[PDB]
Design an enzyme around this catalytic site. Sequence first.
Site, mmCIF file in Angstrom:
data_model
loop_
_atom_site.group_PDB
_atom_site.id
_atom_site.type_symbol
_atom_site.label_atom_id
_atom_site.label_comp_id
_atom_site.label_asym_id
_atom_site.label_seq_id
_atom_site.Cartn_x
_atom_site.Cartn_y
_atom_site.Cartn_z
ATOM 1 N N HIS A 58 42.654 2.855 48.180
ATOM 2 C CA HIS A 58 43.276 1.632 48.719
ATOM 3 C C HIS A 58 44.602 1.866 49.455
ATOM 4 C CE1 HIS A 58 45.137 1.338 44.652
ATOM 5 N NE2 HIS A 58 46.142 0.804 45.329
ATOM 6 N N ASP A 85 38.534 4.253 44.092
ATOM 7 C CA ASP A 85 38.523 5.470 43.273
ATOM 8 C C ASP A 85 39.495 6.465 43.980
ATOM 9 O OD1 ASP A 85 36.714 6.347 40.886
ATOM 10 O OD2 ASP A 85 36.500 8.112 42.196
ATOM 11 N N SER A 112 50.607 3.794 43.073
ATOM 12 C CA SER A 112 49.200 4.023 43.419
ATOM 13 C C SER A 112 48.914 5.383 44.042
ATOM 14 C CB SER A 112 48.706 2.943 44.360
ATOM 15 O OG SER A 112 48.822 1.716 43.692
#
Length: 189
Positions: free
Chosen positions: A43, A86, A151
Amino acid sequence: VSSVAPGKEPGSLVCIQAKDGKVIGMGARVHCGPATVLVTAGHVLKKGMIADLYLAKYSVSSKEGKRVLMDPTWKIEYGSLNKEADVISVQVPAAVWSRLGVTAARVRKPTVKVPVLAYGGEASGLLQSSQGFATPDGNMSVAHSCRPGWSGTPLYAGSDIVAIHRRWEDIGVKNLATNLSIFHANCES
Protein backbone atom coordinates in the site's frame (compact mmCIF):
# COMPACT_ATOMS: atom_id res chain seq x y z
CA VAL A 1 9.53 3.57 22.70
CA SER A 2 13.07 4.93 22.19
CA SER A 3 14.44 7.76 20.15
CA VAL A 4 17.36 6.65 17.97
CA ALA A 5 20.32 8.95 17.42
CA PRO A 6 20.85 10.31 13.92
CA GLY A 7 22.25 7.75 11.51
CA LYS A 8 22.33 4.96 14.09
CA GLU A 9 19.51 3.01 12.49
CA PRO A 10 20.29 -0.15 10.50
CA GLY A 11 22.25 0.44 7.22
CA SER A 12 19.47 -1.31 5.23
CA LEU A 13 16.60 0.95 6.46
CA VAL A 14 14.98 3.59 4.29
CA CYS A 15 12.13 6.00 4.68
CA ILE A 16 9.73 6.40 1.84
CA GLN A 17 8.76 10.08 1.61
CA ALA A 18 6.40 12.19 -0.43
CA LYS A 19 7.65 15.22 -2.45
CA ASP A 20 7.21 17.50 0.65
CA GLY A 21 9.05 15.13 3.03
CA LYS A 22 6.12 13.44 4.62
CA VAL A 23 7.26 10.02 5.71
CA ILE A 24 4.55 7.69 4.47
CA GLY A 25 6.23 4.32 4.82
CA MET A 26 9.56 2.65 5.31
CA GLY A 27 11.50 -0.05 3.58
CA ALA A 28 14.70 -1.98 3.43
CA ARG A 29 17.20 -3.16 0.98
CA VAL A 30 17.43 -6.98 1.14
CA HIS A 31 19.52 -9.69 -0.53
CA CYS A 32 17.23 -11.55 -2.88
CA GLY A 33 19.08 -14.43 -4.49
CA PRO A 34 21.91 -12.85 -6.65
CA ALA A 35 20.66 -9.27 -6.36
CA THR A 36 19.03 -6.92 -3.90
CA VAL A 37 15.53 -5.53 -3.85
CA LEU A 38 13.67 -2.83 -1.85
CA VAL A 39 11.10 -4.68 0.32
CA THR A 40 8.07 -2.77 1.65
CA ALA A 41 4.26 -2.79 1.97
CA GLY A 42 2.10 -2.97 -1.11
CA HIS A 43 0.00 0.00 0.00
CA VAL A 44 3.01 2.30 0.35
CA LEU A 45 4.17 1.54 -3.17
CA LYS A 46 0.66 2.12 -4.69
CA LYS A 47 0.97 5.76 -3.76
CA GLY A 48 3.96 6.16 -6.14
CA MET A 49 1.72 5.34 -9.16
CA ILE A 50 0.12 8.87 -9.05
CA ALA A 51 2.71 10.93 -7.14
CA ASP A 52 6.45 11.09 -6.67
CA LEU A 53 7.71 8.93 -3.84
CA TYR A 54 11.32 9.35 -2.67
CA LEU A 55 13.74 6.90 -1.09
CA ALA A 56 15.49 8.65 1.77
CA LYS A 57 18.17 8.07 4.35
CA TYR A 58 20.05 10.27 6.79
CA SER A 59 23.61 11.17 5.70
CA VAL A 60 26.40 10.96 8.30
CA SER A 61 28.83 13.13 6.28
CA SER A 62 26.36 15.86 5.37
CA LYS A 63 24.47 15.64 8.67
CA GLU A 64 21.08 15.65 6.98
CA GLY A 65 18.57 13.58 5.00
CA LYS A 66 19.22 12.65 1.37
CA ARG A 67 16.65 11.40 -1.08
CA VAL A 68 16.25 9.87 -4.54
CA LEU A 69 13.10 9.95 -6.65
CA MET A 70 11.45 6.54 -7.11
CA ASP A 71 10.38 5.39 -10.61
CA PRO A 72 7.07 3.60 -10.67
CA THR A 73 8.16 1.45 -13.59
CA TRP A 74 10.96 -0.27 -11.59
CA LYS A 75 9.88 -3.88 -11.83
CA ILE A 76 8.07 -5.36 -8.90
CA GLU A 77 9.53 -8.83 -8.27
CA TYR A 78 7.63 -10.23 -5.30
CA GLY A 79 4.08 -9.15 -4.50
CA SER A 80 1.40 -7.17 -6.29
CA LEU A 81 -0.16 -3.74 -6.01
CA ASN A 82 -3.49 -4.55 -7.73
CA LYS A 83 -5.11 -6.88 -5.20
CA GLU A 84 -2.80 -7.23 -2.18
CA ALA A 85 -1.96 -5.49 1.15
CA ASP A 86 0.97 -7.92 1.82
CA VAL A 87 4.74 -7.46 1.31
CA ILE A 88 6.01 -6.18 -2.01
CA SER A 89 9.54 -5.88 -3.46
CA VAL A 90 11.10 -3.69 -6.10
CA GLN A 91 14.21 -3.87 -8.29
CA VAL A 92 15.74 -0.58 -7.29
CA PRO A 93 18.89 0.26 -9.33
CA ALA A 94 22.01 -0.37 -7.31
CA ALA A 95 23.05 3.25 -8.23
CA VAL A 96 20.12 4.55 -6.04
CA TRP A 97 21.18 2.54 -2.99
CA SER A 98 24.82 3.64 -3.57
CA ARG A 99 23.79 7.30 -3.51
CA LEU A 100 21.75 6.79 -0.34
CA GLY A 101 24.45 4.73 1.46
CA VAL A 102 22.03 1.83 1.92
CA THR A 103 23.60 -1.56 2.55
CA ALA A 104 21.51 -4.73 2.15
CA ALA A 105 20.35 -6.94 4.92
CA ARG A 106 19.67 -10.65 5.08
CA VAL A 107 16.46 -12.54 5.84
CA ARG A 108 16.90 -14.73 8.96
CA LYS A 109 14.26 -17.39 9.69
CA PRO A 110 14.40 -17.25 13.51
CA THR A 111 15.61 -20.47 15.15
CA VAL A 112 14.71 -19.69 18.81
CA LYS A 113 12.67 -16.89 20.54
CA VAL A 114 14.60 -13.71 19.67
CA PRO A 115 14.30 -10.00 20.53
CA VAL A 116 13.27 -7.68 17.64
CA LEU A 117 13.42 -3.87 17.05
CA ALA A 118 11.16 -2.01 14.49
CA TYR A 119 11.92 1.58 13.34
CA GLY A 120 9.87 4.48 12.07
CA GLY A 121 9.29 8.23 12.55
CA GLU A 122 8.84 11.64 10.97
CA ALA A 123 12.21 12.32 9.42
CA SER A 124 15.23 10.23 8.39
CA GLY A 125 17.24 11.94 11.19
CA LEU A 126 14.61 11.64 13.94
CA LEU A 127 13.60 7.97 14.07
CA GLN A 128 12.18 5.93 16.93
CA SER A 129 12.21 2.25 17.76
CA SER A 130 9.89 -0.19 19.34
CA GLN A 131 10.58 -3.55 21.13
CA GLY A 132 9.18 -7.12 20.87
CA PHE A 133 9.92 -10.78 19.93
CA ALA A 134 10.12 -13.29 17.08
CA THR A 135 9.21 -16.94 17.77
CA PRO A 136 9.67 -19.81 15.22
CA ASP A 137 6.02 -20.77 15.68
CA GLY A 138 4.54 -18.04 13.48
CA ASN A 139 4.18 -14.88 15.58
CA MET A 140 6.45 -11.78 15.41
CA SER A 141 5.47 -8.48 17.01
CA VAL A 142 6.57 -5.15 18.42
CA ALA A 143 4.65 -3.13 21.10
CA HIS A 144 4.12 0.74 20.87
CA SER A 145 2.91 1.74 24.44
CA CYS A 146 -0.20 4.05 24.95
CA ARG A 147 0.78 5.63 13.02
CA PRO A 148 0.63 4.72 9.27
CA GLY A 149 4.19 6.14 8.46
CA TRP A 150 5.68 2.96 10.01
CA SER A 151 4.03 0.90 7.20
CA GLY A 152 6.39 -1.55 5.60
CA THR A 153 9.20 -1.17 8.08
CA PRO A 154 11.12 -4.36 8.97
CA LEU A 155 11.49 -6.24 12.25
CA TYR A 156 15.26 -6.54 12.70
CA ALA A 157 17.14 -9.28 14.57
CA GLY A 158 20.47 -7.46 14.70
CA SER A 159 21.22 -6.32 11.11
CA ASP A 160 19.19 -9.36 9.75
CA ILE A 161 15.40 -8.96 9.05
CA VAL A 162 12.58 -11.44 9.94
CA ALA A 163 9.30 -9.69 9.13
CA ILE A 164 7.61 -6.63 7.73
CA HIS A 165 5.19 -4.37 9.59
CA ARG A 166 1.64 -4.35 8.08
CA ARG A 167 -0.13 -1.96 10.55
CA TRP A 168 -0.87 -1.57 14.31
CA GLU A 169 -3.92 -3.36 15.71
CA ASP A 170 -7.08 -1.47 16.68
CA ILE A 171 -6.14 -0.47 20.25
CA GLY A 172 -3.69 -2.37 22.53
CA VAL A 173 -0.50 -1.12 20.61
CA LYS A 174 0.57 -4.53 19.30
CA ASN A 175 1.95 -5.10 15.81
CA LEU A 176 0.59 -7.32 13.04
CA ALA A 177 3.55 -8.24 10.77
CA THR A 178 4.13 -10.52 7.77
CA ASN A 179 6.48 -13.46 8.38
CA LEU A 180 9.13 -13.22 5.59
CA SER A 181 9.46 -17.08 5.06
CA ILE A 182 7.37 -17.19 1.88
CA PHE A 183 9.34 -14.14 0.58
CA HIS A 184 12.69 -15.75 1.36
CA ALA A 185 11.91 -19.08 -0.31
CA ASN A 186 10.68 -17.13 -3.37
CA CYS A 187 13.96 -15.18 -3.37
CA GLU A 188 15.97 -18.40 -3.04
CA SER A 189 15.19 -19.92 -6.47
